[PDB]
Design a protein around this nucleic acid. Structure first.
Length: 108
RNA sequence: ACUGAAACGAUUGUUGUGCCCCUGGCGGUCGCUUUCAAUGCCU
């Protein structure tokens, strides 16, 4: 619940108590852009992963066809292998509740 | 392991509370217990 920041904010809002909500939002938009520039001049944030692009490129490769595309037989073994292990310690995230689990899944 | 193995939409609850089959009403009207009779017969 990170109670400490509510004390920080309440000091800045008490010191500048003359503000209304809209001239406050004009402050905080400038505070965010300072934070953004400062974070990337120091390099203090990561180039985070891109997993949904990869599984989406593989979703297209299984299920989209234009006439005259080359096509392969799907490896349905991976869809069974993921079900056979869905309740076994060697599965890291839960299996999909809306589908078979042939693509990587994550908690809802 | 049947997309599996076990699997209570459940618990509690008043169709309730008030209510005059009520008000008005003459068993009424007409009607002779009537009609006839020797306290009699003799001293």
């Amino acid at each position: 619940v990170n109670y400490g920041w509510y004390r920080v904010a309440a000091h800045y809002v008490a010191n500048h108590a003359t503000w209304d909500l809209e001239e406050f939002q004009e402050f905080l938009q400038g505070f965010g852009d300072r934070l953004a520039t400062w974070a990337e001049e120091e390099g203090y944030f990561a180039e985070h992963q891109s997993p949904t692009r990869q599984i989406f490129e593989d979703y297209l490769d299984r299920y989209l066809e234009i006439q005259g595309w080359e096509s392969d037989h799907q490896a349905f073994i991976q869809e069974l292998e993921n079900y056979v292990n869905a309740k076994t310690k060697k599965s890291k995230q839960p299996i999909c509740s809306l589908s078979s689990g042939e693509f990587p899944s994550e908690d809802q």
